[PDB]
Amino acid sequence: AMSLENVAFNVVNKGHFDGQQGEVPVSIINNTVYTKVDGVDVELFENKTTLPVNVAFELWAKRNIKPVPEVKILNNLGVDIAANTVIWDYKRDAPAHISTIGVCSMTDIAKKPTETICAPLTVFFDGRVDGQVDLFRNARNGVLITEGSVKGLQPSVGPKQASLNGVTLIGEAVKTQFNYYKKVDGVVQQLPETYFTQSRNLQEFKPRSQMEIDFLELAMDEFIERYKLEGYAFEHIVYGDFSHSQLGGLHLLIGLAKRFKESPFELEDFIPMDSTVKNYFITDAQTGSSKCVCSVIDLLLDDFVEIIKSQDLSVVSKVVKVTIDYTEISFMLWCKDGHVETFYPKLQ
Amino acid sequence: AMSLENVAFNVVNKGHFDGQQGEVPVSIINNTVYTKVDGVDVELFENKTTLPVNVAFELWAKRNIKPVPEVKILNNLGVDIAANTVIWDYKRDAPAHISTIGVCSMTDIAKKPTETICAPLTVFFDGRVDGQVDLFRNARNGVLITEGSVKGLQPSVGPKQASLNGVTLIGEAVKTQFNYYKKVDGVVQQLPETYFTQSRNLQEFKPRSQMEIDFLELAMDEFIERYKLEGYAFEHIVYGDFSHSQLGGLHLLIGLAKRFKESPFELEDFIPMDSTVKNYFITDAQTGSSKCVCSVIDLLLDDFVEIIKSQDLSVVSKVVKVTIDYTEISFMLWCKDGHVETFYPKLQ
Amino acid sequence: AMSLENVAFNVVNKGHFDGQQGEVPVSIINNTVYTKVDGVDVELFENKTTLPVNVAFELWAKRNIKPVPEVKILNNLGVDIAANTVIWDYKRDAPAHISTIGVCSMTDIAKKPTETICAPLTVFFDGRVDGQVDLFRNARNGVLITEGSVKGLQPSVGPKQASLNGVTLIGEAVKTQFNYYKKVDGVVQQLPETYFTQSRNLQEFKPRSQMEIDFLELAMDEFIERYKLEGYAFEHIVYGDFSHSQLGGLHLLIGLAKRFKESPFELEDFIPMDSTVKNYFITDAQTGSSKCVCSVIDLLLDDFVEIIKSQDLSVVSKVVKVTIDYTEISFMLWCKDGHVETFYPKLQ
Amino acid sequence: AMSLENVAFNVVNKGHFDGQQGEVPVSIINNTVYTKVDGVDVELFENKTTLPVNVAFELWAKRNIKPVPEVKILNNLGVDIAANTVIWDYKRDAPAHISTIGVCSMTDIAKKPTETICAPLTVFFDGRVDGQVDLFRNARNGVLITEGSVKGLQPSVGPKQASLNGVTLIGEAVKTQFNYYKKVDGVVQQLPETYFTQSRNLQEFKPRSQMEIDFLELAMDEFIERYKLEGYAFEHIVYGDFSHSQLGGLHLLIGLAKRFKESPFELEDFIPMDSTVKNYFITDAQTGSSKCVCSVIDLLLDDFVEIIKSQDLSVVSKVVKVTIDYTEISFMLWCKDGHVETFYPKLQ
Amino acid sequence: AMSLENVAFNVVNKGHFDGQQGEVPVSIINNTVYTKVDGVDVELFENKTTLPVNVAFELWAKRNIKPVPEVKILNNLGVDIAANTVIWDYKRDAPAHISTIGVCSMTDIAKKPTETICAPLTVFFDGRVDGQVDLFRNARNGVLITEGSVKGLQPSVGPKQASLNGVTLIGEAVKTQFNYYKKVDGVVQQLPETYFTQSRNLQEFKPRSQMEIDFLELAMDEFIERYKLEGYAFEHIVYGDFSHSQLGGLHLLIGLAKRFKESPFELEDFIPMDSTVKNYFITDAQTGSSKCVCSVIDLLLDDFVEIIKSQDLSVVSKVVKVTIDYTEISFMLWCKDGHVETFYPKLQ
Ligand SMILES: CN(C)Cc1csc(N)n1
Ligand SMILES: CN(C)Cc1csc(N)n1
Ligand SMILES: CN(C)Cc1csc(N)n1
Ligand SMILES: CN(C)Cc1csc(N)n1
Numbered sequence A, B, C, D, E: 001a002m003s004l005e006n007v008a009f010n011v012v013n014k015g016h017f018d019g020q021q022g023e024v025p026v027s028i029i030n031n032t033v034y035t036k037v038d039g040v041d042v043e044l045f046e047n048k049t050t051l052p053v054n055v056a057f058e059l060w061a062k063r064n065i066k067p068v069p070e071v072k073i074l075n076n077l078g079v080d081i082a083a084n085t086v087i088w089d090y091k092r093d094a095p096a097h098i099s100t101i102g103v104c105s106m107t108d109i110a111k112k113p114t115e116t117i118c119a120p121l122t123v124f125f126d127g128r129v130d131g132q133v134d135l136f137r138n139a140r141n142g143v144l145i146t147e148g149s150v151k152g153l154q155p156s157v158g159p160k161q162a163s164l165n166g167v168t169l170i171g172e173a174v175k176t177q178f179n180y181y182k183k184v185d186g187v188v189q190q191l192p193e194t195y196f197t198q199s200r201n202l203q204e205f206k207p208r209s210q211m212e213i214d215f216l217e218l219a220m221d222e223f224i225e226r227y228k229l230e231g232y233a234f235e236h237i238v239y240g241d242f243s244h245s246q247l248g249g250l251h252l253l254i255g256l257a258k259r260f261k262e263s264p265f266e267l268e269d270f271i272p273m274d275s276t277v278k279n280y281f282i283t284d285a286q287t288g289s290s291k292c293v294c295s296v297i298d299l300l301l302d303d304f305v306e307i308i309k310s311q312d313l314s315v316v317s318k319v320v321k322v323t324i325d326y327t328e329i330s331f332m333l334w335c336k337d338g339h340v341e342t343f344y345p346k347l348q
């Protein structure tokens, strides 16, 4: 019963695929899906994926329209595929996963996640869908999200935010904080202690603590004095050094947000995907200070201060490993005479 | 209930659209339609039309698989559209008509040829389909084909041949000779008395008369002597003159077929469409004699001899109009001292 | 050290990928790979696959240039992937398998067939490559070909022919007849007793037995008399019935080859892939007799005669299953009064 | 050693081409370069050039990431090609020059600018690169930029701004003001006296003089009074006349910037390239006043005032030639009774 | 007055560009040019070049329709560009040269070959066009063809054949044998004494000497005996050795033509361009003997016999340089005990 014309009918009348009956006239030209609306063609979808246009159209129409974990979380947890849904990746304008289970005849490797092809894959299960907690309970590999408790299983409290139709938000009218569960080879895992990235924008940056309010409001030297940060190189790492041709530090999103209020800068996202650590080719418009690979992480300033203040400062250079978004992030810590020179997410 | 996947299902299982129920997985990439057959994509259709790939695919699947009039006949008769069928043009690899009636939601201007949008268009009707003779009686404009007699309607016996799936043939197991009828502005039009082109190939040329057998077998001077053709310039017009840089004459397909047995030549079909008169950029491989626009017609040699012998040879140059395939073909007749110099389908 | 320019260098200098060092300037435009040869671009490859142009180019350069089993055999045996080679499908102008093992970084699911992702897949192993017989012994699933005996393994003698660079041939300077072995779920499977299709063309058809020579030479009634085939409907099944609008029978390639010498016909290959049984939309040019789905098999006439003469003729209709190319081909046998009416590869 | 996969590796790991060793899996689909990052394709480059996708990708990766002269300056100076670098044109999303020298095997006309093919071309040399001042000294044709003095050669002080990764800026952490030198047929040229365009944006417009601060702050009549501009048509030329259907004047960017603070307007950049004078199809959103070709120049208001006050106002219409960005810009000056009516960059 | 619609008008009415006035409606979709002929689109041109579709269309319409030197001759002579004509390469379906002189505004580097940009380029001049012999006398670099004598210029008699509209022929109604002249750096160059390749096809092969007639008619051992070729390895070099997995010898087109009459073989033209020596990936269908790079030259058998009989047979291996089509072709001559083992165009 699935068809191009039926997917298009659902998009036109329901804003997305809603299992409704009906067909609309469709025309495909190159990578674009159009529909006839009173004698003229109207664009419904432009394929930006590496899948065929009609296939990507159907997967985009069948995307999950509930708040879902951000793609970076799913990737860090080793998710290969979702059970009977499509996690659409709005950063890549493409499906987050290569294959599907019970979604599209062209991409499906199975109809149900109980089929033996899914046994080695880490299947994403959503406890908000009936029967998915039980499917995770019998799955060999999987990642489960829930809104509440699961009998016997100990939860890992996930981030406060989730993606709803490409908008990362902390839900007020919807629940976005999930309990995370993971199984590897039939064994429930104890998920590690983890920090979480805040997933904020440069243009819409809002502080989420009194320390972050003080960072944005106070001058550099009075914030450093207030929070006893002397010797931690926040002037370089967080504020940024725009005095040399190569831009110094600037690895925390809150520091880029502070700079952004004063003067603009170019951020070239050369690997445009969702990731815990982002790399930008940054050009500061005021000074002309630039850096080809400037690693940026959006940690709550308090969490970053806690991380940097919990490090031994007696070695010239070492790798500092921190669990962020369930993954191991390596940082390079450079010290001199017991003070930090730089601390940055390792470009590895 | 029409869909891309249903059209594809019919192509895969029925060799064409057969109104069957079912769907197959389809992928569209550029101008090609594929289907998954055991994990790999198999090409079903490559779009060579100016219509969208999925639209052209549906029209090609819905093509008429009965013997139908050749596109040149339909064009000569002023056919704009077909009633509830698609006349596929195998020479252009595209639908013969821009729009449809009751065939495809993207190309349809109407569901039934009785809709007022069809009134000014010359609609093609097929008497072999129930109700189509009556639809022609009520159509303001149209062309009707029938296998037999329609009470009160004066018939025009059409050509012996018709196109069946792109093969032009004189039916033995099927009827290919139709009665033709035409209406212009609600009035039945008297079709003119006409010659018909034979629709033969250069490579598969077969003589269809004793005169044609003699043309292919006898030498030039003994054929001309046998058929009393002295003074009719058959040496130039039919045999061809390969002695100068510009190829002389060579306007009858049988003459090209005779030459082809002896030595090959290049025929550039610069306007590749079905037409009563064809134009080729011909290069003779043996001599290097060539002509940018060599008009070629496939008339039965007897018909061409009858035409040329029925002309007044007392004027230097004049236009000779001959009805061929229902259209008026202009010829340029050039004479000197009561003999033909050249006679060719007038270049426009 | 694999690159687009290195694959292109190998194509230009070695006719294919040969592991040589070097690079040539390449330009990719749409689906075509070009190389600069003295200031002008020369086409190296036109992508006809659903894979990206550069990816398909690399797989085509890395195609197996030794005689390999025909794709229909591999498909019939359930082959999903090849071990460290590419079986190029010359009929589809695409790789026979979706993924690779140790061939191309874009398509590889593994470097070696011992990786756990290959365990559920039926991997094709070539005993002519060092270590591949051992790899088959440790594979959970696979198909092995060999030129000789493997101690302890019960062989299946395969067809006499193999594909060498797209040419199906019976090797004289090379071995094309292989021993076949198959494993399903770690257990060696007994390959069934089978007939083999002959893989002949209509245009280059050669008889391979005295019965086939007699079929092509004798008239229909004297061949049927010589081989005692009265009551077996060879007039319909093998010779073909061109008297009605729907073409009767014509299911054996030798019968199409016999007809082809007398008069031509159109064969529309609507699912253009390699398969034991082929389906054509056939239009006979002489009569206009046609059939949307005409199933055609190229069996040696003697094998087909043996099959049809080994059937019980006392039931109106039944399915007759025959093992051909290791697969079970269903036939529809229709009888009346102890004589065959029709026998054809069952349309699905 | 140059390859598609190596260029892609450099882009992924270094933010641009950095001569590093390594390869990443690449897929090319249409005009887009992707790389596999954990099973999914991530876009690296979308070709907007008229060069092949892989070729444009390599040139974009090999773009100059130091502050370089703006393309309009290079064009006005007659630069045809750059020595061993790529000047990327961010306004056209394409290389500024057709060919390269020592950059890419597909576009290179030479490896070194000393090769005889470069002798007639004006090669761009960068004194900040070792040996390039000496290469300019021996070049027949060229344009040289330097940060300081060149022995024997008299410099032309260029504009204060340069382009750094597509951002036009006046460097604080980097030097953007260059000394310009030019050679035609082996002879060092005396570059002319020139004004420079300021290269500002409408949205980020900042005044660069007290007169420009007063223009943006004061009302029209008090600015004209303060700067004694009565009779110079600044009301029309700089402020703009929005009272008629055709938009009057509005040829100086500062005037568009002033209007922009009050109400928005549409600027159609119908020839989107870098040029000293820009032409826009402007539609004022508040009034509906519009002009198909509104020539706009960004001159410092003081320079424009100096130019207009240095003209003879006694003729109805004449061409006024001004050297701006080293090129001759023609202006049309229209006067009546000794006062300016209009003064605009000539639409020629 | 040059336009897309005017080029299309000329193609439709004149079979090519003929400088006529007029326009036809054109539509461009992807790489195809169409024209409306009675409401439907008819394909005029499919772009197979790396140039834009409209640009390649114009160059193809403006192709030289007189017999011209074969592209291999022009390439061997170092021709970079043609004076006021387009040499169409029918083997590559593209212009033979990158740029033009006085042909198309998109590809022209000059209007006349006297412009200083043409001075370093070897310009092709055609003495059959008025003023082109004089233009060659003033050109710094060039190749001139003439039908007769140029006072003072020492001629080189070229091959008997030329290309007329893609057909290589020895003219009977047109002159195809030209006098050749070449200039390098303002100095007329003495063209070397050369053999010429015959430019024959495998399918249309005709012997051009009594020795070639005897090669095709006599058995291998009686031809070798008749022409005293014992010890020259013609069994390997010309006849071919099909006994091993790697195809032995087979480097002369006449030997491939002889084999072709007996049994077919696959010739993969992996670098499809016109060249004196061609390389094929050959697969013999009868034996399965194959060779990845089989160099093939079409020399008149007498010329090849003269070349091989004029070599010293006392060294194990040496390079033998032979001038063919004005270029120096290296051959690898392998001897043992005073007899030839192999002699083949040296693989590079
Ligand atoms: C282009 N990308 C945003 C995909 C998309 C969604 S809706 C539409 N026209 N395109
Ligand atoms: C390419 N043209 C013949 C259309 C067509 C019909 S089936 C197929 N693959 N293409
Ligand atoms: C078009 N298809 C045969 C693939 C291919 C191989 S070589 C070339 N130019 N294309
Ligand atoms: C589309 N244009 C901005 C080129 C470009 C640079 S990085 C990328 N994906 N495209």
Ligand SMILES: CN(C)Cc1csc(N)n1
Pocket (backbone or CB within 6 Å): E043, E044, E045, E046, E047, E048, E093
């Ligand atoms: C496809 N190639 C032969 C170019 C061309 C000339 S005419 C036409 N339709 N295409």
